[PDB]
Scaffold this active site. Structure first.
Site, mmCIF file in Angstrom:
data_model
loop_
_atom_site.group_PDB
_atom_site.id
_atom_site.type_symbol
_atom_site.label_atom_id
_atom_site.label_comp_id
_atom_site.label_asym_id
_atom_site.label_seq_id
_atom_site.Cartn_x
_atom_site.Cartn_y
_atom_site.Cartn_z
ATOM 1 N N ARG A 1 0.784 -1.233 0.000
ATOM 2 C CA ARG A 1 0.000 0.000 0.000
ATOM 3 C C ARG A 1 0.818 1.287 0.000
ATOM 4 O O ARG A 1 0.232 2.350 -0.168
ATOM 5 C CB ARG A 1 -0.945 0.035 1.191
ATOM 6 C CG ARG A 1 -1.844 -1.183 1.326
ATOM 7 C CD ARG A 1 -3.254 -1.040 1.781
ATOM 8 N NE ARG A 1 -3.801 -2.384 1.980
ATOM 9 C CZ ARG A 1 -4.267 -3.195 1.013
ATOM 10 N NH1 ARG A 1 -4.237 -2.811 -0.251
ATOM 11 N NH2 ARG A 1 -4.720 -4.397 1.301
ATOM 12 N N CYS B 1 3.517 11.972 21.535
ATOM 13 C CA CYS B 1 2.150 11.536 21.089
ATOM 14 C C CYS B 1 1.919 10.032 21.267
ATOM 15 O O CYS B 1 2.800 9.269 20.913
ATOM 16 C CB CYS B 1 1.834 12.019 19.666
ATOM 17 S SG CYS B 1 1.196 13.686 19.822
ATOM 18 N N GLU C 1 -9.908 -5.159 17.119
ATOM 19 C CA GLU C 1 -9.130 -3.964 17.012
ATOM 20 C C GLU C 1 -9.662 -3.192 15.799
ATOM 21 O O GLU C 1 -10.114 -3.777 14.800
ATOM 22 C CB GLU C 1 -7.648 -4.319 16.837
ATOM 23 C CG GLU C 1 -7.265 -5.442 15.819
ATOM 24 C CD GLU C 1 -5.877 -6.035 15.981
ATOM 25 O OE1 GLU C 1 -5.675 -6.705 17.017
ATOM 26 O OE2 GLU C 1 -5.041 -5.893 15.049
#
Ligand SMILES: Nc1ncnc2c1ncn2[C@@H]1O[C@H](COP(=O)(O)OP(=O)(O)O)[C@@H](O)[C@H]1O
Lengths: 465, 461
Positions: free
Chosen positions: B175, B277, B349
C-alpha cells in the site's frame, strides 16, 4: 525412610492418593514411595507461591543475596549426606555425585551476585518536573521440571537464580530420585528462605499438565527428553508462558580425510566408551571411515525390559542395512562397546537415542554434506571437527549452528541437549558467560516516566478525611 | 508508472498479478505494484544466499563505513523521501519527517554495532589449546513491514541485521511501497554490495514463500495480530527465529483522584488520520464518578480533524449494550462508554479515532483487565496517590509505564515469543535484543595436534 513428603507453603505435606515406588538401581529393591499429585495439591503450591511473591519481590537485593550465601554454606556442610542420597536412588559413583553437587554450588554462588547486575538508573527532571527510571523486575511465579540424571544440579541451575531475581518457584522434580532434590530444598528453608518462595511438588504427567495449565505461572523451565520438551514448549508457549526447554540430542564429530587418527580416536574413545558426549562420527570420504574402523575395533575389545530395549535397538539397525562392526552384548547381561558403520539418518539407530556405549559412523562425501547433516536435525550443544586444514576448520566454525565447537579437541559437555525456542540457556557453558541469559529469562524490563501534576495551593481543604 | 523489485542489485520489472496503490488523502490510484510468485522470491533468496559469505567476512569497520554513508545520503534526500511517504500513506509531512528522523537514529545505532560484537581470545587456555568466543551472523534473514511507517520499521530491521553481517530480504507493504524502495536504493548508492539487501513486493503469497524457504533463518514482522500469530507459529514450526509485533490496545487507568485536565490532555493527543504523542484506545475508570466526569469533558473536545468495515464495528457495539456517546460516522471521532471485555468492540481492534471507556470498581480489577489480555507496549495511570502509582508500576505487565504523563509510543503492539524487541524504546537500551536476534554466539576451542618431523613427505601435492 518410608514415604517422601511435599514441601508446599513452608511445611512438609503427606499426600496419599496415586503412588509409585523409588527403586535402588544398584540393589533392585524398591526403597520408598512417591506421591503422584492431583490438581488440588498443585493449586496449593501455586497459591502458596502467588502469596509469597509480593513480600519477596520487595525484599532488598542484599537480603536475598544473604539468604543465598547461607544456602551455599549449608550445602557445603551437608555434602556427604546429599551425595549419599544421589548415589542411592540414581545409582552412580559417589565421586560423580559429589562433582555434580560441586557444579550445583557453583550455580548457587553465581546467583548470590545476580542482585548486583540488576540495578537500574534514575534521572530527576528528564523533562520539566518529570522523573524517569528503569528497573529489572521479577516476572512472578515460575516453575521448573527436572530430569532423572542430575537431581542436584539441574534444579540448582534453575531456582536459585530465579529466586535471586525475586520470583517464587514451584519445582516438580523426577519421581525416580526425588529425595536428594527435596533435602536441598529444605536446607534452603533452613538457610532463611520465607515460606512459599520455593515449593517442591512430586508427580508425573498430571502434575506437569497442571503447571502447563495454571494461568498464574508465568514461566516454565524444562530439561529432559526431546518429546516431552517439544510438548512443554509448544503447549506452554501457546498459553502465553515463557518456556525454556532442553531436550536430549546427539552430538556429532566430523572427521576430515586429513584427520590425525590417533587424536580423533582418543576423543571418540573417551566420549563414547571411556569428558564429552558424542554418539555419531560423520566421516568425509570412505578412506578415513575405513581407517577409523580399523583403529576403533581393537580398542573397543581393549576395555529385563531394558535387555529387550537394547536388543531391539541393535536388531533394528541390522534390519535396516547398517553394518554391525562390534556387538557389545555379553556377560560377566551387560552392554559393552557397540559400533555401527554405514549408518544413515533415515535409520532408527540414528533417530532414537539409546543409553550406553554406542557409536554410529555416517559416511558422507563433502564437508558441506556433514555440516548440513548436523544442522538439519535437532542439533546438540557440542560438536567437534578433526582436521589439519585451517580453511576447513574456519568454515566449520562459521557455518555449523552448534554453540560450542572443538577443533581437534573434545569439549566439557557430558550430555547432549537441543535447546528450543528463543528463551535459550546453556547448561554446561561458563556460568559467568551464559548466566545473563538466565537472568533475562526470569526478569522483565520496566521503564517508568513520572510526574505529579501541581496544585496552586496546599491548604488542608485540598486533601481528604 | 510501475514500481520495480530490487533483487540482486538491479531493478526488476514484474508483470503478473498486480494491485494499485492509492493516494489515501485523495482516494485515487496513483501506481501499480507487483504481487510476486515463488520464483521471483527464490531469485531474491538465491541472491542473498550468494552475497552472504563475502559480506560475512567483510571487516567490521568497512560495514560501519557503508552504514555511515547511508545515514548521510538519507539526511541528504529527506525532502524527496518524506514527500513519497505523505503521498501514499497520507500524513502530515511533519509527522513523516519525524518518522524518518527515527529511522535515521536506527541507522546511527547500527553503525556502532560492530564494536559491541567483538569477543575474547586466549592463547594456551590449556596446553597448546587456544580458545575464543565470537558473535556470528546467522545467514539470510527476512523482514515483513506494515503500512504505517514505511520508512522507520524497515530501518529498524535491516541496517542492524546487515551490520551484524547477515543478508536481508525485505517484503514491504503493498500500500505504500515507493518510499521504502527509494531508501533501499540509497543504501546501494552508499556502497552496499549486490544481494545484501533485496526488496520484493507482494502479499500473502510472497510472505508464505519466505515462511517456506529453508534458506531464510530468521523472520521479523510488525503488523496485525492475526497475521503475527500466523507467522510466529508457522515460522517457529519450521525451525526459524521469529520476531513478531501484532497490533494491540493500550490502556489508561483513571483513579478517582485523577487530575482530569491532565488525563484528558493525554487521551486527546492519541489521534488517528486516514515528542510524546501516544496511542491509547481504552480508558479504564475506577468508579463511576470519574467516568461520568471524563465523558463530560471528552465530548466537547471530540470535534477533531475501511469506512464500510467499521460501521459494522460500531453497530455491533450498540447492539451488545455499549453507550455510543459520540458517533463519528461520516471525519471520525467516536466515543463509547460502558464497554465490557465481553463485547466485540473490546476484542476486535478497530481502524481510526475510537476511544472506549470501561468502568471498573477497583485498581486490582483495572490491572487484571490490562494484564489478562494481549497487553500492549504502553500504559498510563492518572492519580495523585503515591501508593496506587507504586503498585500499578509493580504489578502491571506492560513494559513502559507513564504516571500522569503520556509515553512516546504512537502505535500499540503486543510482542510474541521469546525473540522480543521493543519498537519505541530507547535504542541503546533495547538494541542488544536486536543484536541477539540477528547473531549466534560461538565458543571455539582449538588445537593443532603435532607431528614429530616436518619434511616435505608429510604434506600433499
Ligand atoms: N509424558 C510426560 N509428560 C509430561 N511430563 C513428563 C512425562 N514423562 C515424564 N515427565 C516429567 O519430565 C521429567 C522426565 O522427563 P524425561 O524426559 O522422562 O526425563 P528422564 O527420562 O531423563 O528422567 C520428570 O520430571 C517427569 O515428571
Amino acid at each position: 525412610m518410608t514415604l517422601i513428603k511435599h514441601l508446599i507453603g513452608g511445611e512438609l505435606i503427606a499426600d496419599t492418593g496415586r503412588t509409585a515406588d523409588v527403586f535402588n538401581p544398584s540393589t533392585g529393591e524398591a526403597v520408598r514411595k512417591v506421591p503422584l499429585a492431583d490438581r488440588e495439591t498443585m493449586q496449593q503450591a501455586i497459591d502458596a507461591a502467588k502469596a509469597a511473591f509480593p513480600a519477596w519481590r520487595n525484599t532488598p537485593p542484599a537480603k536475598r543475596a544473604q539468604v543465598l550465601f547461607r544456602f551455599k554454606q549449608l550445602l557445603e556442610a551437608n555434602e556427604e549426606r546429599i551425595v549419599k542420597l544421589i548415589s542411592e536412588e540414581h545409582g552412580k559413583t559417589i565421586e560423580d555425585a559429589a562433582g555434580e553437587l560441586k557444579r550445583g554450588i557453583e550455580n548457587v554462588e553465581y546467583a548470590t551476585a545476580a542482585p548486583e547486575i540488576l540495578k537500574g538508573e534514575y534521572s530527576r527532571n528528564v523533562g520539566p518536573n518529570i522523573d524517569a527510571w528503569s528497573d529489572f523486575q521479577p516476572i512472578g511465579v515460575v516453575a521448573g521440571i527436572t530430569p532423572f540424571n542430575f537431581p542436584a544440579m539441574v534444579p540448582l541451575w534453575m531456582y536459585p537464580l530465579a529466586i535471586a531475581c525475586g520470583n517464587t518457584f514451584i519445582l516438580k522434580p523426577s519421581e525416580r530420585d526425588p529425595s536428594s532434590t527435596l533435602l536441598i530444598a529444605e536446607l534452603f528453608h533452613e538457610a532463611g528462605l520465607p515460606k512459599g518462595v520455593l515449593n517442591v511438588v512430586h508427580g508425573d504427567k498430571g502434575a506437569v499438565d497442571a503447571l502447563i495449565e495454571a494461568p498464574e505461572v508465568k514461566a516454565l523451565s524444562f530439561v529432559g527428553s526431546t518429546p516431552i520438551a517439544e510438548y512443554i514448549y509448544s503447549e506452554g508457549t501457546k498459553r502465553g508462558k515463557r518456556v525454556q526447554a532442553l531436550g536430549g540430542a546427539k552430538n556429532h564429530a566430523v572427521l576430515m580425510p586429513d584427520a590425525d587418527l590417533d587424536n580423533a580416536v582418543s576423543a571418540l574413545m573417551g566420549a563414547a566408551y571411556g569428558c564429552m558426549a558424542i554418539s555419531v562420527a560423520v566421516c568425509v570420504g570412505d578412506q578415513i571411515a575405513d581407517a577409523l574402523v580399523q583403529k576403533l575395533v581393537p580398542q573397543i575389545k581393549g576395555l529385563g525390559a531394558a535387555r529387550d530395549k537394547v536388543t531391539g535397538y541393535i536388531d533394528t539397525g541390522v534390519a535396516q542395512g547398517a553394518e554391525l562392526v562390534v556387538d557389545g552384548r555379553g556377560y560377566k547381561f551387560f552392554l559393552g562397546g557397540t559400533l555401527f558403520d554405514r549408518v544413515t539418518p533415515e535409520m532408527t539407530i540414528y533417530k532414537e537415542e539409546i543409553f550406553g556405549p554406542v557409536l554410529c559412523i555416517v559416511r558422507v562425501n563433502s564437508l558441506e554434506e556433514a555440516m548440513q547433516l548436523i544442522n538439519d536435525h535437532e542439533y546438540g550443544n557440542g560438536t567437534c571437527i578433526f582436521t589439519r586444514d585451517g580453511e576447513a576448520a574456519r568454515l566449520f566454525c562459521d557455518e555449523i549452528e552448534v554453540g560450542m565447537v572443538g577443533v581437534n579437541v573434545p569439549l566439557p559437555v557430558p550430555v547432549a541437549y537441543h535447546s528450543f525456542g528463543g528463551w535459550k540457556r546453556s547448561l554446561f557453558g561458563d556460568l559467568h558467560a551464559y548466566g545473563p541469559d538466565g537472568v533475562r529469562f526470569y526478569t522483565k524490563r520496566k521503564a517508568i516516566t513520572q510526574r505529579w501534576p501541581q496544585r496552586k495551593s496546599h491548604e488542608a481543604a485540598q486533601f481528604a478525611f
